[PDB]
Amino acid sequence: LPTPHEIRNHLDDYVIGQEQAKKVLAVAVYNHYKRLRNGDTGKSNILLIGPTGSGKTLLAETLARLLDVPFTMADATTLTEAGYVGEDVENIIQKLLQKCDYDVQKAQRGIVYIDEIDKISRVSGEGVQQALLKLIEGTLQVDTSKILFICGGAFAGLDKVISHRVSEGELLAQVEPEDLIKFGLIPEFIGRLPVVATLNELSEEALIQILKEPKNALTKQYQALFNLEGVDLEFRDEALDAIAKKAMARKTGARGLRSIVEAALLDTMYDLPSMEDVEKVVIDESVIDGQSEPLLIY
Amino acid sequence: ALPTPHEIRNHLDDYVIGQEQAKKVLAVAVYNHYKRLRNGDTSELGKSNILLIGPTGSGKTLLAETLARLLDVPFTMADATTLTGYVGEDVENIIQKLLQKCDYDVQKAQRGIVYIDEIDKISRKSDNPRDVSGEGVQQALLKLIEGTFLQVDTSKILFICGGAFAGLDKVISHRVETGSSEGELLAQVEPEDLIKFGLIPEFIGRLPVVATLNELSEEALIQILKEPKNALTKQYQALFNLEGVDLEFRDEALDAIAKKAMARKTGARGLRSIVEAALLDTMYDLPSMEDVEKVVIDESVIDGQSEPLL
Amino acid sequence: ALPTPHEIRNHLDDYVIGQEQAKKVLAVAVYNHYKRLRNGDTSELGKSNILLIGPTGSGKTLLAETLARLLDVPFTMADATTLTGYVGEDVENIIQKLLQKCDYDVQKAQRGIVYIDEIDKISRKSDNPRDVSGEGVQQALLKLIEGTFLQVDTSKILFICGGAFAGLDKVISHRVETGSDKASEGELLAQVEPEDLIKFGLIPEFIGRLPVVATLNELSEEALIQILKEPKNALTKQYQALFNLEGVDLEFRDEALDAIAKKAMARKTGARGLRSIVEAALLDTMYDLPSMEDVEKVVIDESVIDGQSEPLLIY
Amino acid sequence: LPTPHEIRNHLDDYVIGQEQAKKVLAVAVYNHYKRLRNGDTGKSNILLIGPTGSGKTLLAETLARLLDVPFTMADATTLTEAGYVGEDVENIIQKLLQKCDYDVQKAQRGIVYIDEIDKISRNPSITRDVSGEGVQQALLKLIEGTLQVDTSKILFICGGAFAGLDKVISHRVSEGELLAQVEPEDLIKFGLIPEFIGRLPVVATLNELSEEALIQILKEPKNALTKQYQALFNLEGVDLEFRDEALDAIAKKAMARKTGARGLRSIVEAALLDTMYDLPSMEDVEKVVIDESVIDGQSEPLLIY
Amino acid sequence: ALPTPHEIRNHLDDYVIGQEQAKKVLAVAVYNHYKRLRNGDTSLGKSNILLIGPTGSGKTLLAETLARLLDVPFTMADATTLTGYVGEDVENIIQKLLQKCDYDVQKAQRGIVYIDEIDKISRKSDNPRDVSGEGVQQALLKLIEGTFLQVDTSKILFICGGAFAGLDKVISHRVETGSSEGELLAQVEPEDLIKFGLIPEFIGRLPVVATLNELSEEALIQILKEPKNALTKQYQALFNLEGVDLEFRDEALDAIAKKAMARKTGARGLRSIVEAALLDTMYDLPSMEDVEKVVIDESVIDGQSEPLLIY
Amino acid sequence: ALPTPHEIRNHLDDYVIGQEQAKKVLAVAVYNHYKRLRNGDTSLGKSNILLIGPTGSGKTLLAETLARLLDVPFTMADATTLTGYVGEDVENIIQKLLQKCDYDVQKAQRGIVYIDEIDKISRKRDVSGEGVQQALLKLIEGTFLQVDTSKILFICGGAFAGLDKVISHRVETGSSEGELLAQVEPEDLIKFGLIPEFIGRLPVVATLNELSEEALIQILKEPKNALTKQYQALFNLEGVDLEFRDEALDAIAKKAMARKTGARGLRSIVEAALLDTMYDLPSMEDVEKVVIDESVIDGQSEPLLIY
């Protein structure tokens, strides 16, 4: 079992900065699996509070991979309706099992990430907290008490509440279950999330990492898109850096990256299904200046 | 069988005059959107939601409507002004209405297109000074953009938000400036510019595709009267045609109509009302006559005194 | 054999006084509408739906009704106010009723004309402040305008939506104005534009379904008088007929007729308020008429305006 | 032919007050039969708008009798279903003929009263009962002329309370003065189709209730309070007798409280409560209610053994 | 086989203390109501009731007891929760009645519905929303008459209760002449409710009017003893399944009554008092081994001394 | 076999610090409630409870502990989220109770329901708040789950900030908070904002003492699941002994007060103080770690490490 040191060390190679949060997660994760090992003798669940594109999703995946443990994501926005009939919640446990080959144990060790938790707080989101709480609370048959839950969120209005209860970065550090309660989260749900981590920083080296690292990264998306056409899309590292610069110069952020990449591939994607070639290559000149069109290989 | 973005733009040229760039943008945005829907499969993909930015009476609404028709897809219009708590339950009204025109079919509703007008109006900023309620809508409608007793998911449906953004031109200039036309500036538009304008970051990040329209030229109006497959001249020539009469519009008359429209600042929206009044007397005594063709000159339009040639 | 707009308007002149422009518009709109139906063939064609805009008691309803009669076509009236979810299934009620009067005939129902009154009432706006329900009707009835177990299609049927639009005059002015006002209100309703109806409370998609826009002008004091005399079924002629089968001659002094017109204008009911005025003025007379044995009754100004002095009785 | 003076004059002996409505009806009726006489050369139909127990029904009957003209009533509520098969409407024309000895002319002069019109105007929830909006049509097919008899000649009088009408008219811009300003528009917005209202040119109004009617409502109707209570007491084997003076006292009580027709029951009940309470405990032939048991409640009803 | 008004009142005497007149009234109203339903035939009285009495007089109890005594589905509702969308919440009273009714339409027709705080929705200058309140009087009015349950509310009996604090004043202003409280609630007339805030058409739907008299201070003691489910009987039963006999001295019962009156909570405040007085006893009760516990005045009023313990 | 009030209170002393009187009260109320349920028979007390104490006094904890001590389904709700459509959201409390109850109707009847911030809905929007007092009042009595809420025990908590003032204005004669909350009467809650019929449904009234800094220390040590014991256990399965110096424990309590988070803020403080230590713990090889004041308050110095 990896030490909290080893864990954080493997977290630095995937996400730049956030030293404090990487500590909290390391200990939270370590203790969790340290409690599962050697038997019980039980909730070290985590609450990631960081802006969108802070690396929340990326961190979760990394933790799962470095532990060689089944992982699965879920959106509080999609779980809102909880399905017209039944519980859309039990669905993610089935996905975790599918990625697990249906091995009850391997699944109980699994990690689950629920994004946009700050969204549900006021199907009514207040009822979603309960549907998601029925999950966290242990129920072919699998108890969820053993699986580690990580709930990510931006919590836009949280900084205000905490600043009232008595800049933004230092404020979030003083977060307390009370703040989350007054935010919209029920006391019962917060009680299931003892651990609370925070993220407050983004870098160019981070933007470039977000562009390729995440299993759900822009580059991977567009590549899949171009791939449907039978075309291979190649992003020169220089192009990725140029993209990062553009994003910074416009102080857009992580969500701002897509608008840049799209504007660089727009024309290409426009008149591509009308021609036949093996692959296309994006150079930094196609991005930073948009002077030249992407390379075409037939 | 989906139409290539080439084909989409081609048909858009039939209902819309100018805005070639905006039409190229929409052509791709649309193609990719439904291309994604038809071949949907786990792993990431863009929302492909659009943000129309152009002067009043430029063709923002028309483009949206035409797009729907060209794709035989349910279409519904909404105004962001009518939205700015109980309206949070009125935002889903946009959905039930889409279902209404969708034969109450959930899947075809997912194909639907929704156009929100006057988005720039709900922007909370010092310019043109309620802010709290307005932002509440940006975030409430924001929940829709993502996608959540219809049971329909708004993730599948394409969102097209239009707005004139009168002040956007000024802020973009204050940014692009260096040391010491509008269309050229609306091209340098960036998310941070919309930020300072009044739109929240999380909302803008949901509208990746940004199309920009150029104000219709005086000359363009004339094209609007002729070129479009449903051009006024073509509509009235058809009317006069099932009467056994040929209707001829002299270029001097068409330009005359365009000028009348500009003096009224009604753009293309004021075209019909002008043409109607000019052919009003003619159509009254048309079925009572027995001639070959009627010719509309300038004197019939501008002066509105002389009668059309018979 | 369809009647030319000339013939249509000519006959409208027999049942309606004034509104010559509106009548020319309707004449053309109507002619084209049925001209399109009879020679219907694939390829574009205007819906030709109409939007009547005039003061109360100007003749909006009368025009619609007369149009139907002049074209021997089924006609049904509806009020947009009674409409403002379950009413969505009450909008189709307008159809079943049209079928009722149509001998239940689907094709002749397609020929039918539907007049919706008080459309300006359902407009959602800050002026005269439910909005959500009202707009819902604008859009619900909007589905009809386009055209969709009668099996009838409402695409064929002509829609005539009337309204007074009390505030429309103000907004149009706030637009047409230049620098620092037009002579007559009717002069403004002429400069009317779809965008003016937009700001008023009507949704764009709805207005776009009413291409033809007709505007009525308030009847003049003298015009009201003509309505009391000239028409074949003029009030005076109707009451003279009533008094006639009593063996009595009814005379309306011009001072009395103008008196009635003025009473009507003060009530802003236009011609619609004419009868109610005449009735009240002849109420007492008609009550003790059959008990008498005189030659003729003469209505002076003092009987109408005053409403106190009794009509002259000539034995 | 009776003059409007003579007509209203004969209406004062059957109904107290309502001078305005008696005028309107006098002229409406007179003109109607004056148009039938001497031939045509045609709709003077009336719409009675008054509270239940205002005397609407009484006025109609009175008008028919004073003219010696066949008369027949009908309930919009009963005509709702319009019969499972056929038209329950044509039925009332047959009744008018039966009371007429089947003389086509005498029948065409006849008067017909349709009560509870305000009821037919409109979630249907797949209800078996026929829609009132459709009833307006079935009833309109009637008003509009059709062994064979044309209805165009018979005078139709439609009575109703129109509870919600006063609101509509107060919005369009107390209750007594409001109803006077009634207009076909108000009735349209109420629920009545324009085509139906167009057949009812004349509109009369009643603001006060009538004791002469209250007393009549107490006994005349087939479901009158007296008849019902008698059936109740009858189950006990007891005969209930309502003294005429008692019925009048009851009417007074109702008027003094401005309750209305529906208010009568609360009065009668309060007068028979004790009796009905301790009646199944004793055995007697009949009970009799005097005006003293009602107007004062001083003494208990009489018991006959 | 329906019970005579005599039998109905007799059983009401078992669950309810006092209110003999109101119970006579309800006895007839009820009997007649169901007598009409069972032998229903064309060519009758709604027989709907209007309860008028002070708070904690027995208005609710009477209604509930009536239902039980007739094995008929019963549902409670409040006019305050009602005062457009609530128009569709009025039919909620029906679906709930059907719920407790095994979803049987006919049994639902037999059901009894009690609406509390009717005097609250009355639109008047006294205690000054009016438009919404009146809207409910008329909305619920539609129910009283009777109209996807498919059930008709004509069959179901409606019992509307209320304290009518101001009603006493107006009745006085009318009955006055020249220059107990229950004596005035007896002279109550429909026109008095009119001036109070109720609409004529609504009042005309409640022909039966019952009036309750505020329970006497002395009656409180009876309430603690006589009722079949009297507090003393409830706690004696509790102490009984512990092998202990619980004795309430009369000095203690009167003491409790007085405590309740000083708190102006009437009978509603009885339980809270008794509980507090027996709290410590019940705590260390299962840990003892005595014969009986005797509650004296000192244990209640003083609340200092402990109850007597007989080994 | 039901536990005597003595046994119930004894176990409560393990999870809760202080509040001995309230625990005696709850011990009796609880015992009687289920004593009534198990031996239920015609011809009894509702036994519903009303917790009144300052914020973070242990109102919620007591409720939760009671449930655990009786292996009975437990669900929490907030009266604030309640204050027409919420009338159908009141039954939501029930369906949730059923959720945790394995969807068993009978065991749901055994369930315990805690409503927090009851003093908040007291009408002294007002119309809506009262509507809830009454809507929830229908529950207290007991009515497609088919479950009857008569059987389930209701525990309503509240701080009642103003209640102290009104009680004083009454108990006064002529010319501590705990001493006054003892003299609490239903009429005092009446004037506060609660309706008579609602209060009459909460016969059992428990009162909690104001939070004391000194007690916080006991909360860190005494409880069977005390933070120190939890962390010592964590450090124990690492082969390390965790020692909390009294100067360190008092330090944590003071930190908690300055933040006015009472006991709820204890963990967050301890975590942050042991964060770095737990991070580089499994990478060391020492005998025990000693937490002094300097590690907590200053938060600068590291904990003592004895090899």
Q: What is the DSSP string of C115-181?
A: EEE-GGGS--SSS---HHHHHHHHHHHHHHHH-------TTSSEEEEEE--TTHHHHHHHHH-----
Residue A13's domain is classified under what CATH number?
A: 3.40.50.300
Find the distance separating the first CA and the last CA of chain B, reported in whole Å.
49
Are residues F182 and F68 located together in one domain of the fold?
yes
Q: How far apart are CA A219 and CA A100, in angstroms?
A: 27
CA distance B16 to D184: 48
E141/E129 Cα distance (integer angstroms): 18
Instruction: List the one residue out of E33, E25, E201 whose CA is nearest residue E109.
Output: E33
Q: E190, D280: Cβ pair inside 8 Å?
A: no
C165 and C50, same structural domain? yes
Same domain for D146 and D189: yes
Cβ atoms of residues B179 and B196 within 8 Å: no
Nearest-CA neighbor of D215 among D244, D185, D183, D239? D244
Q: Distance between CA B205 and CA B47 in Å, rounded?
A: 10
What angle (nearest 5°) sits at the alpha carbon of residue C202, between those of residues C196 and C204?
Answer: 85
Option in D222, D235, D263 nearest E190 (CB): D263
Rounded Cα gap, residues D92 and D115, in angstroms:
13
Chain C nearest CA to D107, separation (Å)? 23
A 10 A CB-CB count for A273 gives 16
What is the total residue count of chain D? 305
Q: In this complex, do E200 and D263 lie within 8 Å of one another by their Cβ atoms? A: yes
D74 sits in which H/E element: strand D71-75
Tell me the three state secondary structure of residue B71.
coil
How many residue contacts between D and E have a Cβ separation below 8 Å? 68
- Cα separation of E230 and E257, whole Å? 14
Q: Quick check: helix, strand or coil at residue E122?
A: coil
CB-based burial label for B199 (10 Å; 0-12, 13-18, 19+): buried
State both tokens at F26: 């709850």
- Which of D10, D44, D195 has the highest number of chain C CBs within 10 A, making it the mutation to test binding with C? D195
Among candidates D271, D140, D155, D154, which has minimal Cα distance to D198? D140
Question: Is the same domain home to E8 and E129?
Answer: yes
- Inter-residue contact B125 to B134 (CB < 8 Å): no
Q: Let me know whether D165 and D252 are in one domain.
A: no
Clarify whether residues F75 and F31 are in a common domain: yes
Q: How far is C278 from chain B (nearest CA, A)?
A: 37
The residues with which C214 forms a beta bridge, in sequence order, are: C52
Residues of E with Cβ-Cβ distance to D222 under 8 angstroms:
43
Residues 6+ apart with CB under 8 A from B51: B119, B161, B163, B194, B204, B207, B209, B210, B211
Domain match, C75 and C92 both: yes
How far apart are the two ends of chain E, measured CA to CA in Å? 52
What's the burial of E260, exposed, middle or buried (CB within 10 Å: 0-12/13-18/19+)? Answer: buried
Distance CA E292, CA E276 (A): 19
Final residue before a domain boundary, out of F209, F228, F253 = F209
Q: D200 in the Ramachandran plot: left (φ > 0), alpha (ψ -120 to 50) or beta?
A: beta
Which technique was used to obtain these atomic coordinates? Answer: X-ray
Question: What is the token pair recorded at B210?
Answer: 């940004």
Residues A217, A236, single domain; the answer is yes
E205: nearest Cα among D56, B14, D260: D260
Task: Determine the Cα–Cα distance for residues D71 and D76; give it in Å rounded to an integer.
Answer: 17
Residues 6+ positions from F233 with CB-CB distance below 8 Å: none
The DSSP annotation for D20-67 comes to: HHHHHHHHHHHHHHHHHTT-------EEEE--TTSSHHHHHHHHHHHH
Report how far Cα B97 is from the mean position of its chain's Cα atoms.
19
Is E222 found in the same domain as E204?
no
* A252 to B190: CB separation less than 8 angstroms, yes or no: yes
Neighbours of A (≥3 Cβ pairs closer than 8 A)? Answer: B, F
Q: F158 burial class (0-12, 13-18, 19+ CB within 10 angstroms)?
A: buried
Element (H, E) at C314: strand C312-314
CA angle A28, A32, A35 (to 5 degrees): 140
Q: Considering B180, B214, B248, which residue would you say is the last residue of a domain?
A: B214
Q: Are residues D170 and D82 in the same domain?
A: yes
* CA atoms of E170 and B132, how far apart (whole Å): 49
Q: What are phi and psi of E149, to 5 degrees?
A: -70, -35
Q: Who's near C169: CB < 8 A, 6+ residues apart?
A: C185, C188, C189
Q: Which two tokens stand for residue A48?
A: 């990631």
Residue position matching structure tokens 């409710």: E193
Flag if A4 and F276 touch (Cβ within 8 Å). no
CA-CA distance, B80 to B137, in Å (whole number)? 8
Does residue A161 sit in helix, strand or coil? helix
Phi-psi region of A47 (alpha: psi -120 to 50; beta: other; left: phi over 0): beta
Count of domains forming chain A: 2
Is B259 part of any known ligand binding site? no
Q: Which two tokens mark B170?
A: 């000024």
Instruction: Say if residue C266 is in the same domain as residue C133.
Output: no
CA-to-CA distance for A72 and A57, rounded, in angstroms? 10
Q: Which of these three, C159, C193, C217, is where a domain ends? A: C217
User: E strand or H helix at A197, and its extent?
Assistant: strand A195-198
C246 touching chain D per CB within 8 A: yes
Structural domain including F283 reads: 210-307
In this complex, the residue of E80, E237, E279 whose CB is nearest that of residue F43 is E237
DSSP string, B215-255: PPPHHHHHHHHHSSTT-HHHHHHHHHHTTT-EEEE-HHHHH
- E41: helix, coil or strand? coil
Q: How many CB atoms lie within 10 A of CB F58?
A: 28
User: F240 and F289, same structural domain?
Assistant: yes
Which subunits have 3 or more CB–CB pairs within 8 Å of chain B? A, C
On whether C66 is known to bind a ligand per the annotation, the reply is: no
**C97 touching chain D per CB within 8 A:** yes
Q: Which spans in chain B are helix H? A: 5-15, 20-38, 60-70, 80-83, 93-100, 106-111, 131-146, 168-176, 182-186, 191-197, 201-204, 218-226, 232-241, 251-263, 271-284, 298
What's C290's domain CATH number? 1.10.8.60
Spatial CA neighbour of B79 closest among A211, C203, E150: C203
